[PDB]
Amino acid sequence: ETGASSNASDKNLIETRCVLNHHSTQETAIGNFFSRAGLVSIITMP
Amino acid sequence: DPIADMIDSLTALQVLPTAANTEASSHRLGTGVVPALQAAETGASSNASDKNLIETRCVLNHHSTQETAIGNFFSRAGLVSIITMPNTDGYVNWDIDLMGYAQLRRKCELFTYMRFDAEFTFVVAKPNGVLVPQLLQYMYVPPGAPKPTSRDSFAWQTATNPSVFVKMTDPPAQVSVPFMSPASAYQWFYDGYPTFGEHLQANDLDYGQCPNNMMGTFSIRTVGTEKSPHSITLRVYMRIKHVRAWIPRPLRNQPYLFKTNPNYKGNDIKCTSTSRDKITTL
Amino acid sequence: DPIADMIDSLTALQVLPTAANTEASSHRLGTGVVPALQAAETGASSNASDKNLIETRCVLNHHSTQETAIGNFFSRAGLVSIITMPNTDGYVNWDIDLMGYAQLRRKCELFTYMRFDAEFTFVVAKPNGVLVPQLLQYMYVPPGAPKPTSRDSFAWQTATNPSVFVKMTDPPAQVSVPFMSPASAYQWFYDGYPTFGEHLQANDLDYGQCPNNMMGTFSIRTVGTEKSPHSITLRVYMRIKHVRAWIPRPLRNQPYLFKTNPNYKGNDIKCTSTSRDKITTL
Amino acid sequence: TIWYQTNYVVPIGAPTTAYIVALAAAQDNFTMKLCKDTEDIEQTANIQ
Amino acid sequence: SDRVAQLTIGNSTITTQEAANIVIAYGEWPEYCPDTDATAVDKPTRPDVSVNRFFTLDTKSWAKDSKGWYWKFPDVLTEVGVFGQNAQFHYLYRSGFCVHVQCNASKFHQGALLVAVLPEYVLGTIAGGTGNENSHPPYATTQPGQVGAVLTHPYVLDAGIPLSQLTVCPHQWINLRTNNCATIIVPYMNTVPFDSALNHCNFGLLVIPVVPLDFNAGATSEIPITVTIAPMCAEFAGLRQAVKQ
Amino acid sequence: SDRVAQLTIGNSTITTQEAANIVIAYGEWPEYCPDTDATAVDKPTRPDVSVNRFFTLDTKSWAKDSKGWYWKFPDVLTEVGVFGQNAQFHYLYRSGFCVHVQCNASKFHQGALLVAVLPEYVLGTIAGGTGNENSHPPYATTQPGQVGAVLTHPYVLDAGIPLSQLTVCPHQWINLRTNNCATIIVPYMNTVPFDSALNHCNFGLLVIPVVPLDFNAGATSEIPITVTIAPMCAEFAGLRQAVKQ
Amino acid sequence: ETILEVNNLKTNETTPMQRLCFPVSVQSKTGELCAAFRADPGRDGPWQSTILGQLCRYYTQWSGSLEVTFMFAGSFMATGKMLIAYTPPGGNVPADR
Numbered sequence A: 001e002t003g004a005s006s007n008a009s010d011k012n013l014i015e016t017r018c019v020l021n022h023h024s025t026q027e028t029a030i031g032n033f034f035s036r037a038g039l040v041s042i043i044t045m046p
Numbered sequence B, C: 001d002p003i004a005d006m007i008d009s010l011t012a013l014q015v016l017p018t019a020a021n022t023e024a025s026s027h028r029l030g031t032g033v034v035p036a037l038q039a040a041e042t043g044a045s046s047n048a049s050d051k052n053l054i055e056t057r058c059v060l061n062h063h064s065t066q067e068t069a070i071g072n073f074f075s076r077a078g079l080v081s082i083i084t085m086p087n088t089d090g091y092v093n094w095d096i097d098l099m100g101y102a103q104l105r106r107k108c109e110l111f112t113y114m115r116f117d118a119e120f121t122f123v124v125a126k127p128n129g130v131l132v133p134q135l136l137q138y139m140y141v142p143p144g145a146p147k148p149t150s151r152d153s154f155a156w157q158t159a160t161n162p163s164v165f166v167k168m169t170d171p172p173a174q175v176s177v178p179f180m181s182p183a184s185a186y187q188w189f190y191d192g193y194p195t196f197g198e199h200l201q202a203n204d205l206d207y208g209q210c211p212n213n214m215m216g217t218f219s220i221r222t223v224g225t226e227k228s229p230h231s232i233t234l235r236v237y238m239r240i241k242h243v244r245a246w247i248p249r250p251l252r253n254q255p256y257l258f259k260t261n262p263n264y265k266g267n268d269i270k271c272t273s274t275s276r277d278k279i280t281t282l
Numbered sequence D: 001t002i003w004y005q006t007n008y009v010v011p012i013g014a015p016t017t018a019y020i021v022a023l024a025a026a027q028d029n030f031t032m033k034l035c036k037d038t039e040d041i042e043q044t045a046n047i048q
Numbered sequence E, F: 001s002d003r004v005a006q007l008t009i010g011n012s013t014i015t016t017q018e019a020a021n022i023v024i025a026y027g028e029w030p031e032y033c034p035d036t037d038a039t040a041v042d043k044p045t046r047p048d049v050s051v052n053r054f055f056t057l058d059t060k061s062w063a064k065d066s067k068g069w070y071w072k073f074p075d076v077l078t079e080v081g082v083f084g085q086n087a088q089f090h091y092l093y094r095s096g097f098c099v100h101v102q103c104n105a106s107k108f109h110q111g112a113l114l115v116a117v118l119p120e121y122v123l124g125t126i127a128g129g130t131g132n133e134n135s136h137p138p139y140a141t142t143q144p145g146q147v148g149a150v151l152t153h154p155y156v157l158d159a160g161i162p163l164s165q166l167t168v169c170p171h172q173w174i175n176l177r178t179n180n181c182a183t184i185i186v187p188y189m190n191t192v193p194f195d196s197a198l199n200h201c202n203f204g205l206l207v208i209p210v211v212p213l214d215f216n217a218g219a220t221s222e223i224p225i226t227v228t229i230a231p232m233c234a235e236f237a238g239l240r241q242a243v244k245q
Numbered sequence G: 001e002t003i004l005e006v007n008n009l010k011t012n013e014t015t016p017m018q019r020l021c022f023p024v025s026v027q028s029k030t031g032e033l034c035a036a037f038r039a040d041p042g043r044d045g046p047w048q049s050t051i052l053g054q055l056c057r058y059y060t061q062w063s064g065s066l067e068v069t070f071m072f073a074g075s076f077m078a079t080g081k082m083l084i085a086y087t088p089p090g091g092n093v094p095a096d097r
């Protein structure tokens, strides 16, 4: 009800191991999300 | 600590740009030292050399080992697909499976696992080889994305899908493709089933199918709304770059039959060697 | 180390020779500090004292806590056996089970586990209490040893078994017996079965029988080859020394029926208290 | 799956049926890759 | 704000908002067996996550004339999960427990349960009624499994010992106006460092309604009681083929 | 005096007096998964004695016209012991293996077996004989269990690849005049750090008689072949109810 | 966090505001299940109504941990205990608690 999202993590709910992950966050940046050519118009001269 | 039992590779790499030199040797007579007698049951290859079996001279040879490196063995464009638009409504959806042509398939299946970047070249012409001014569009459809249902489908808007627009009188198109498996390598051999459940005889096609190699759909079309009067023939070629390979395998001695299984014709088993008449006469 | 997760009591004793002193206290008026309100649901006993509920004086008391120590509570000889030789061939083999008399049984069953040394006294007379010049022999037969089958058996040679020769006109014999269980304590309650297998209704007698408490056979005889004309009555008394006890239990409020089980008469359940007529009139 | 551990207990005067709202998000080790076309929007007819 | 609690062990979590303290039985936490107390020479196995986790048993129904229930440990878990498989393939076992009993009701209900742990709970019979039969309890009574059994004479605890001094054992209450749960952490208690899991029961858990359940007509009449348990430092030794009993 | 060997792991010991070396496949010993290569976040279980021990399968009979046998790993052990129970209760598994094949005969017998380990041994069919049917091998063929299966066309290894270059894989020979056993230690080989034990087989063990068995009439004609295997660094993760297949 | 449509029934399609909450009631038998759904954020089902399940559809592969939050909207006078389980792959919905 406070409008805040949950702050519970993996380590506080279950017993976890150590994971060193190197998954990049580059592709979900909005520059990479939008820099793709898409169709905006089709113009015809009959 | 009250509990005392809770307290708790063989070889390395070397750079060898040339083949090995030969040292000079003389005769040898004695007991106890027998380098020619081996034991093949240990699983080890023979370690006997030239200098221990015959009398040798000194040879300083500079023969390079660069061409047999697996980067030079694989960086050659080979045919992986032939797509035709005689499929009479002006578009083809082709499911990406690069095991349909025997020459590149036998080279890649020397190893079990492989991780590489690719380079795809699209050589397009008419079925007799003539070229016409005609605009085409190639689109890569990843798994989960909507595939086109007609020539004027909404999926050709390609707002996020990567797409190439090209003409037939142009040079062939080239793109670079990264390593895009969810695993750490591609495997040409997957011993098992993808899903759980019972494995009955009607679902025996599932055996050997790895979804980590399924990369989606490659779609082509002629761009305009109206029907084109030209027949299309597209040939796809693939170079393998930045390659790593694991676990060598026996090379196949039987002709291929299907794209997804190692099935072989059982009535004509080919012998690996060429036969002769007698063991004493060559 | 490449793997990081493979790297990895409340109270104490005090000597209290006397009971606790009382401090002087005065009145107390205020909010927030309520030592009289408790919470019995936590499983903890109340920690409220004299000085927080009433106004007290200073009392320096020197009442000793020595007699309620479990060494003083248990070091008293109580009856464990009555053996009679009217058994008409001059010997008795008695299987050692000390749970046949209710007074020492209820004291020992206050705890679950107990580890002690013992001292056994043998008070022997005629059935009417008269004493005669008569030689007797008591032998302890450990489990596995041969027990005597007659008055002139070979087992009375006692070459390794401990034996006492005594006369009836002598003082009573006393011996010291160590702690001889294969476990670390004797248990008066064993919730389970000794052996494996199926547990059918015909083998329900096995429930509750611990072989760690079974100590063997106590044998008596008159020494001579010929028959003695005197009847014998032997009373055995046991003191408990060097005692350690664990896990207190509820004391039994029902009369005992058998020596090996907690069975009780179900048609006459005794209430623990003495009844009255009204809750307001004592 | 969600199960009853004990019952839904209620006194007199309060309703015997309640409702649960489920909310979902991602953690801080969440990533995505290989950006592609979605399949939720379509366009069969021309817009405007 | 100590009325809220969270118990996390393994891949399981219990949350409660209406609680008393946690009782640690005899002031001792469960431990592994040290080298000075051990006697068996083979190396024991410690699975440490697949066996040390919360296990939820079947659910009882508290009626207005309920007598009480009991469970036997570790007999409740000898057919459940990876703990039940390690207890059948091995000859020796050793572990402590964390017992959690749940019972919620509204603010217009009343009643009180006594939740106690009694080690070496040996059961008796009524001796045929008249006291002349040397009767013995059946195998379904002494080891009832994960379902549990009902007490016939709860005033003498079916063993000739009174309920009124059962609070000399580690215990809690579930008073319906105060809390809805009880939590006892039990160490390993035996005369031997290891024992059999199929032949011997270390302790029994007793849940008896001392004050009976009461409510007015129109409120919820289905008041259930759930028991959730967790092994703590489970060790197993003496590996051989699987033996069920 | 390196012809004698002793392999002790768990509560099991193998002795041999007529042996070659031990082959360590690709020069690598089995290991647990490090933190840099792992992806799953839950803590795995490592039983370390009850699963890392020698397991003896059924025994074959070497005749004078035997084709060969194969086994699939870890499919041979998914119903055996505590390893077979951890593989059913968990979703992910990871381990290496120590394979030991035994075959003894007298000094008047002759014959040679090739004992090889082939990772990702995918089987083919004869495609209906004529090559026109897209046939697939049945489930009893691709995963034969602890019994194993017989090779139909051993010259092409039932997969279209020749026997003559099977020695590019980690292998040993059992030559009856020289030794009576073969030992290969295999690490974990996959494209993923953990995988399913019921859906995926890492490698296959092939035992093929290259030189056929021969003896004169009057000697012992019952020459058996026994396979004994041991997991080495077995890990399990993803605990859930038991799934058999 | 955005709302998960666990109550995505075919009878709810003409009154679609009921798909945002699922009921909980007084039971007669013990250990019943209230709801069951898959934990796949990019699959068709209850995860389609979330902004995480909508932005996943623009990508091909995903990784990482998820979270589901359940909020009880009953009376102050109502009590109860629920068991919310997550099962790794290998089987169907579990038959009992």
Ligand SMILES: CCCCCCCCCCCCC/C=C/[C@H](O)[C@H](N)CO
Binding pocket: B096, B097, B098, B099, B118, B120, B138, B139, B140, B162, B163, B164, B175, B177, B186, B187, B188, B213, B214, B215, B218
């Ligand atoms: C406009 C660009 C279009 C080009 C898109 C090409 C992407 C596909 C690259 C896949 C790389 C090889 C993946 C595996 C191929 C084999 O078919 C599998 N191993 C099947 O066994």
Ligand SMILES: CCCCCCCCCCCCC/C=C/[C@H](O)[C@H](N)CO
Binding pocket: C096, C097, C098, C099, C118, C120, C138, C139, C140, C162, C163, C164, C175, C177, C186, C187, C188, C213, C214, C215, C218
């Ligand atoms: C000549 C010496 C004879 C005396 C031999 C006496 C040895 C026996 C001592 C046993 C000490 C008590 C052991 C347990 C007694 C009870 O019967 C068991 N707890 C049965 O429940």
